[PDB]
Amino acid sequence: GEIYTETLQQTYAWTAGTNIPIKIPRNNFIRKIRVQLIGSISNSGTAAVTLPSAPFPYNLVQTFNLSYEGSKTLYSVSGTGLGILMYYTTKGQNPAYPAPGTSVPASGSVNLNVMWEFDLARFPATMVQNIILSILTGQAPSGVSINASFYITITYERVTAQEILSEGGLGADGEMPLATVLPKVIEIPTFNVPASSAPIHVAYLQPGQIYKRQLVYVINSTSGINNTDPTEYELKIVRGVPTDKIKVSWAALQAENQAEYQVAPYSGASAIIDFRKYFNGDLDLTHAPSDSIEYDLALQNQDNVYSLYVSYVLPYYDQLAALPAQVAAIVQQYVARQKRRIKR
Amino acid sequence: GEIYTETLQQTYAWTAGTNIPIKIPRNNFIRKIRVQLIGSISNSGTAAVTLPSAPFPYNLVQTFNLSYEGSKTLYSVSGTGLGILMYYTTKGQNPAYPAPGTSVPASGSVNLNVMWEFDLARFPATMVQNIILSILTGQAPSGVSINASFYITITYERVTAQEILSEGGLGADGEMPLATVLPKVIEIPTFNVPASSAPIHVAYLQPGQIYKRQLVYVINSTSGINNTDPTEYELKIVRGVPTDKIKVSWAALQAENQAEYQVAPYSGASAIIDFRKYFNGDLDLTHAPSDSIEYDLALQNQDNVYSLYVSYVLPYYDQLAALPAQVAAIVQQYVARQKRRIKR
Amino acid sequence: GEIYTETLQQTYAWTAGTNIPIKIPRNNFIRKIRVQLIGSISNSGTAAVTLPSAPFPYNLVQTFNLSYEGSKTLYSVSGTGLGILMYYTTKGQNPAYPAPGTSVPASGSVNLNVMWEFDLARFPATMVQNIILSILTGQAPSGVSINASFYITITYERVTAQEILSEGGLGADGEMPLATVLPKVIEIPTFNVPASSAPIHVAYLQPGQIYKRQLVYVINSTSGINNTDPTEYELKIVRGVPTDKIKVSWAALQAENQAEYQVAPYSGASAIIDFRKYFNGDLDLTHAPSDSIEYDLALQNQDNVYSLYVSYVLPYYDQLAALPAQVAAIVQQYVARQKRRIKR
Amino acid sequence: GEIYTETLQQTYAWTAGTNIPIKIPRNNFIRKIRVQLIGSISNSGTAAVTLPSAPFPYNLVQTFNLSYEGSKTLYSVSGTGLGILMYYTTKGQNPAYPAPGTSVPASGSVNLNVMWEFDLARFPATMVQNIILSILTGQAPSGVSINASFYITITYERVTAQEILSEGGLGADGEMPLATVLPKVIEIPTFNVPASSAPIHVAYLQPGQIYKRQLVYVINSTSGINNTDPTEYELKIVRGVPTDKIKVSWAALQAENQAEYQVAPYSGASAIIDFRKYFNGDLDLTHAPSDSIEYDLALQNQDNVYSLYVSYVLPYYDQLAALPAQVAAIVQQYVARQKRRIKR
Known part of the structure; x- marks a missing residue:
């Protein structure tokens, strides 16, 4: 509008x-x-x-x-x-x-x-x-x-009111439009992820949302956010055959951020992972079983790893999926537009 | 070509x-x-x-x-x-x-x-x-x-000549191609807009053109363009019930320039407002009645406000509008391409 | 995938x-x-x-x-x-x-x-x-x-195997998918192109590839890559009546890179010329006779000019060319995504 | 074969x-x-x-x-x-x-x-x-x-080619034979699990694989792998009524290793627990919700516990399960023979 x-x-x-x-x-x-x-x-x-x-x-x-x-x-x-x-x-x-x-x-x-x-x-x-x-x-x-x-x-x-009907009216319970895409930018901090050379399990992505990108940064007690402990980052699919979407060195992860964000690393201890480039489209776990995708870190010393997610939920995710190939085609085009609006 | x-x-x-x-x-x-x-x-x-x-x-x-x-x-x-x-x-x-x-x-x-x-x-x-x-x-x-x-x-x-016919030939008077888009980067200076806290009327956008974005900046007699007087910007549709497409503070206007242009503010006294984000597509006044949209300024002191607009005209805007849904779809695809070429 | x-x-x-x-x-x-x-x-x-x-x-x-x-x-x-x-x-x-x-x-x-x-x-x-x-x-x-x-x-x-069939299967000889887009980032250095004020012939682009952009930079023996000799760049189509796709001053070429790449010139002796902007789409010489396109340089002194090209070859360029308006439409769309994937 | x-x-x-x-x-x-x-x-x-x-x-x-x-x-x-x-x-x-x-x-x-x-x-x-x-x-x-x-x-x-068919042909996506049994020998290390007399939570077994046996051993900073801290090991089912499949004292766990492997203890800090002997056949968690089975440790001082699991996954675990009682009887016979092959 x-x-x-x-x-x-x-x-x-x-x-x-x-x-x-x-x-x-x-x-x-x-x-x-x-x-x-x-x-x-x-x-x-x-x-x-x-x-x-x-x-x-x-x-x-x-x-x-x-x-x-x-x-x-x-x-x-x-x-x-x-x-x-x-x-x-x-x-x-x-x-x-x-x-x-x-x-x-x-x-x-x-x-x-x-x-x-x-x-x-x-x-x-x-x-x-x-x-x-x-x-x-x-x-x-x-x-x-x-x-x-x-x-x-x-x-x-x-x-x-008119335009709303033009994207699938309201939800099941009619509290928001069917094509609603609620941003879920949460940040889950982890404490004392131990010092190791091989990336050790840091935390799982909990399902119930579609992940667009993840911002991870470590916090040394001494140098604050200005250290270089994060050395080896890793996104592991744990459920089933152990598979690795990312097994990139910290320097190299900050490298893709150079080309990706065309900006200097915010500190020696930060980085960003776009799921659309390691999966097909956004990493969805709306229905995936728990503890099926975790991300690791090889830290120089033992500190705290903060993980901010730019994820979003579709409050009627099911009616969108249970919509005719006819309607879904138009509604999906609205949801697709909305999901990209929530960048930062 | x-x-x-x-x-x-x-x-x-x-x-x-x-x-x-x-x-x-x-x-x-x-x-x-x-x-x-x-x-x-x-x-x-x-x-x-x-x-x-x-x-x-x-x-x-x-x-x-x-x-x-x-x-x-x-x-x-x-x-x-x-x-x-x-x-x-x-x-x-x-x-x-x-x-x-x-x-x-x-x-x-x-x-x-x-x-x-x-x-x-x-x-x-x-x-x-x-x-x-x-x-x-x-x-x-x-x-x-x-x-x-x-x-x-x-x-x-x-x-x-071939390609020109491929866009709707020439105009009615045949002086330019029908799908022509003449850039109208005019700059209208306003003088002595008095100091106020509530955005006082500065000037109206007169019709006869499509507005793309407007570059507003004030000039103090003392600090020149290096002041921080512009404090409150405001785009008011005056015709009809009064309405506000913009009622954003100066800091925040330069803010949208941070996310928008990814560049620090040119001075404490400048900014740019995109009409495409406050309207649907470009703000057109080709036929809208005069004194129907003006922009205000709350100035710290009383100075000079210069307004540079990046607007463009359609020399046969009526033949583009009076064309068959058949041809209009194609001609519109050219004017649509061109208008976007005139960014700066 | x-x-x-x-x-x-x-x-x-x-x-x-x-x-x-x-x-x-x-x-x-x-x-x-x-x-x-x-x-x-x-x-x-x-x-x-x-x-x-x-x-x-x-x-x-x-x-x-x-x-x-x-x-x-x-x-x-x-x-x-x-x-x-x-x-x-x-x-x-x-x-x-x-x-x-x-x-x-x-x-x-x-x-x-x-x-x-x-x-x-x-x-x-x-x-x-x-x-x-x-x-x-x-x-x-x-x-x-x-x-x-x-x-x-x-x-x-x-x-x-699935997706590969979905873009035109394999090549003629089946060594790569029909829609293969091999990057051919080569670099051809020239020695002692003499000091002149008028752009003198430096080197031709030999055919057999689609050029995406060309990175040219000169090397003074004294100041190295930090000189300002390259003053006049020029892309001449030599076959036939000579024509000029580019006759832009060095200052102006780095000027287009400021707006292009939003970064200061790497040094006074470098620049990049996008063929996409001097022709319609990329400059293709897959089938052009050799010595048909050369680029010139007016150097303050006589030095060595290095020319890095980001070009790409289509190992089945002919089957892509001899494909039905049917299939060619889809296969083209894959090669199109790919040709642009090779940016850097 | x-x-x-x-x-x-x-x-x-x-x-x-x-x-x-x-x-x-x-x-x-x-x-x-x-x-x-x-x-x-x-x-x-x-x-x-x-x-x-x-x-x-x-x-x-x-x-x-x-x-x-x-x-x-x-x-x-x-x-x-x-x-x-x-x-x-x-x-x-x-x-x-x-x-x-x-x-x-x-x-x-x-x-x-x-x-x-x-x-x-x-x-x-x-x-x-x-x-x-x-x-x-x-x-x-x-x-x-x-x-x-x-x-x-x-x-x-x-x-x-034939034999493959004799065990259920290929998978759903046909990338391995239906009766595939991929070994999943992973080792997840835990750091700084505290000294305690009562077995304290060490870590959960994450679902997505069938566990055969688990190799747990502690690492003191002083005695390395030659210490005697692990005294009380414990396999706790957390989901449901809290139930203990194992609550055996360290000496005795090394004891079952005497009878089991007919070999002296590798060091005072190691052992193996065969799930086949505490469940009926293998401990499967292909589908149990996570954090449903954890193993505990009462360590003398505070050290590092490494858990090496010899587990295996069935990449078509569902089709093996969704097979007719006729086919399933035969397919299960291959998967059954495969799983016992991966001992060490």
Whole structure:
């Protein structure tokens, strides 16, 4: 329909270690929600204080949580998570000032401007209840004080009752259009994946969703996100004959990110795997049995591996499959378009 | 047909405050004309002179004016205008040396190299008369002397009589092919829009053309184009019930430029708005009544807002619309292809 | 089918002035082979040794040569040749550490990590014999020691007997699928093309292949690949009345690469010319008489011009040409996807 | 068919920390591949160097990797893993010299002869691609130099077109015979399972294969594989009513190994548990939901537990099951004979 964007006038002060819940008005359908930490980082101290390095400024917002009906979660990532995903999908052109390690002049200040983006394809926001984007802010860097707020810029698409019927009307239970593609950008952290030379099992992909891409990055206790432990990444199909979709070295995985995202690696410890290139189309596990696909890591030291998934669920995935080759042909073309809308 | 490029033998020495008219050879159809200010900026003074900042080097060519038959205007922009349009549509990768604020070694020189690009879709240059690209150069920066020349690089497409018939022949009056798409990159400056917090009316888009994207940027008398006054942008459909395709804050408008153009903002005072994302396809006002869509600005101080539009006209827009669903399907496939060629 | 990638467990020590033949397992078809010179460059000298500039680190690998059956050559490029091709086709983001001229702390070391990528579209590796990528390493920079190895990362595509029939079965002689698209990335160097201001004949493209793009770069004996001699590039069709597909100035050619590849010129002496933009689609010389297309260069001085071509041959180009308008329609669509898969 | 065995001429020099990939000729089907590190261990030093103790010599080949098409893994164990498994299934009669702790006469030498055996039942090696056995050797014992090579002894069974039909023809997709029994000897290591008196959770058996027996052994950082921490092993069915198939004390588990394998314990830290004796026939988890059977360990100190499983998968496990009681009776007879072939 008629996509259109506006900023919500009511803003929110960034206070350290707080949960600032945001109401996202449900005017029409929602295509994407941008969030911005905009202000400055002030040093009132006598000596020029150097800002923490990556993931900062990103981690100033410890975690993100966009959900509707207080129960259904569309997003659950940390600013460090969604922030890094942002760093890739945009050739590292995503707003994040100041850069890691920048100095706040002694008794002067710097500029704060960071952004995140939750792509909800074409979320039927008028048919659901309470789209509350809860931002659980992190910690103010040491020596400086964050003096910014958040600006929610929402993208609506004026889907009409008519147009909705033109893609298969409503779902089975009629709560969203049949061709709904709810984004499920979750991030599941794993702790203490041990040091090894041969990639050891890290975690399984749980079924119940179609995976578009996976962002993995390790966290050393010393170097934070700036280490080089991840050496050997590996996506293993465990169910049945043991088969390997990926058995690529870390350097080489960051290599495909050079050609793929045309951008420098975000840190020595991060990378991205697009399922459409290792499978045919997106890696679907809507109906695959549990613990059938796991991803491994050969880590130099023993740390924590964070895995962010840009996956999505089809709330009527069955009626889409049980649709006539006649109708399914048109509906699938809508679902196909929506699945690509949820990039970042 | 057979696109092919060559630089014109004839160059033009850049002199300050001069109008240099360039004749553009009419060999085949014209797809794109590049201009290059190439030479050096010399400092003969005892101390190293720092070059003026943005819009420099761009403003070295105060204005551009590409038109045919001396009466029909295809382009009418400023170097600062088209330069910023160039800075965005090319991921800020467009040649522009030296950068703003560069030092010309004391009794030495730096390198000059700036570029502009007028996309004429597939302009029927063999069918019109006198394609004259008039560059009214601006002022040589203070303390240094511009020592460059212009290089016109033209892209012809070997469209043949046969191929022309293959798109709906010629127009009603037979002056260009029916599926012609003349680029109308005009730039309309507005003066003294007063300071406000609520977007106050700046100017209307007058009808008679299809709008593709609009490049808006303000000019402070003090910081020039390096201010942060533009704070609130707004595209209001005034005719009928008032409606808002855009009511996004400035920060957020530059935000969409981050994800959109994958390039840092040209200055705190610029941005670009794509109508295709706020409408369905391009924002057409070929026949819409006047003063029906205006764009607002909430300015920190009171300044000058320059608006460069990348729009295009269909010289037989009615024969394309008054054509059989039979031919219209095919002719439409050509105009549809061409309009997209005029990006920059 | 099902693309899947892995690194070969077996690596190769980078030694100065050696030929290291590599075996590429023929598991499925091969989509692309990445090679990484990963290690470090240690300086054991008392004072910090600054590494040679461009083309380094790329030239650490003097030449590459991937071919099958000891007789059929898919690649014939130098590390400096393929290296710049990599620098362009990836927005200059391809791994290449340390940068030219980086200093190795005195009795300390730096990081070595360089990459190349041979795109074989969907090379029928299971139907050929001996896919051997011979890497003939070059010379260790003066004063420092290269402490790296090569990592062969292969991308196989699970093309099945089934799917193969689905694109036109096998060739005439049945040695590859009818829709095979062999990449022929060769590099032809010329010596002492004299200093001239008017583009002088440098070399013809010998027929027998479809050229996709050509990477030209000059080498001054003094400044190496960091000179600015190439000033005038020109693609002349010599058979018949001479014609000019290109007569663009060097500045302007790198200019088209800025907008093209969104990255600064690799050095003043390099550029890339896409045949797709100077003709309709690719420049085919499968059947053109030899000496019918040459490219010229007006060099400031007299040096050596290296011309790397990313062209491809269709081993059954005639059956693709003598196929029914029926089948030709589908087989064409496969070759079309494949020809573009070989970008870099 | 006609089982027949031959040694491959091509040997492989054992070098420390190298990966040596072996191609296994794909002549007929493959029944078993034996590997032998045969040579000597030389001491050129003045004092006679005592060879490291167990797992040496086994760990001279740090890891093994037999897989086909480079992606589907048949084996994935360590020289210490497969070596210990070999140590049991052959009444400790498997060639393994010198014994742990043997002295290499001062400036003289000893005899090296170690062996492994990968049982592939009757693997359809001619219908697959690239059976590559990758041996990533370990480190030369300290003070001595391993002077050996590997000898690949493969046992083919000449299965004919007819015979294949006599067991149910081909699979669903016809890529192996219906009665195929792919060995799945994997080894999943667990790190830092804590010291406890009560068997603490060590790891779950993931579904997707039928388990024959599992080789568990602990690795102390001090005593290596020569400790006595595992005291209480325990096989717990977690799904359903919590049930214990095994709750045997370590001494006694090594006890069943006395009667079972008629061989002294490989070390105080190892054992084998045959599922066939705690279930009726094999422990199958081709279809049980995951995390339904885990095995526990009460370790004296806190160490590393490696679990080598000798399991096997039936790539057409469903058609064997969906076969008529008539055909199934015969097909089951082949699969039944195949499964018992893969002992070690």
